[PDB]
Amino acid sequence: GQQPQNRMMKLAYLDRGFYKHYGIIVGDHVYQLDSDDIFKTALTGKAKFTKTKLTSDWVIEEECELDYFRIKYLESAVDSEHIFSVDKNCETIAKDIFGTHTLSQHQAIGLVGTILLTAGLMSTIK
């Protein structure tokens, strides 16, 4: 067997008028928070990942190389339908980021979700 090539992942968004809804394109699928309103996500403090099929409505902002073997972190987040908090600042910093041990899938996905939320919220500043 062989070493799989990295895939290009893309950060992209759907313009939803009041905000830009961000997602991670891998192949012809887009990983994103399962939310139709960034404000609801922010106020409830919780989110879940979902996957949708790539469409022409997605606007690509950035591209970069993703380790083939990390794609399943995203797939697992969707499949497990797991909720995570986006308002547990203290433990995220002290345990996850500063914990200095390879992030768990749940730790990693939590941080990715925070990034997508941050991007959506930034987009609301008109």
Task: Convert the chain into a string of H (helix), E (strand) and C (coil).
Answer: CCCCCCEEEEEEEEECCCCEEEEEEECCEEEEECCCCHHHHHHHCEEEEEEEECCCCCEEEEEEEECHHHHHHHHHHHHHCCEEECCCHHHHHHHHHCCCCCCCHHHHHHHHHHHHHHHHHHCCCC
Experimental method: X-ray
How many angstroms separate the CA atoms of 116 and 111, rounded? 9
Q: Resolution, in Å, please?
A: 1.7
Please name each of the domains of the chain with its CATH number: 7-122 (3.90.1720)
Q: Provide the b/e sequence for 52-85 (b: ≥16 CB within 10 Å).
A: eeeeeebeeeeeeebeeeebebbeebbeeeeebe
Q: What type of residue is 115? A: I
How many angstroms separate the CA atoms of 69 and 74, rounded? 10
Which residues are designated catalytic?
A: 21, 90
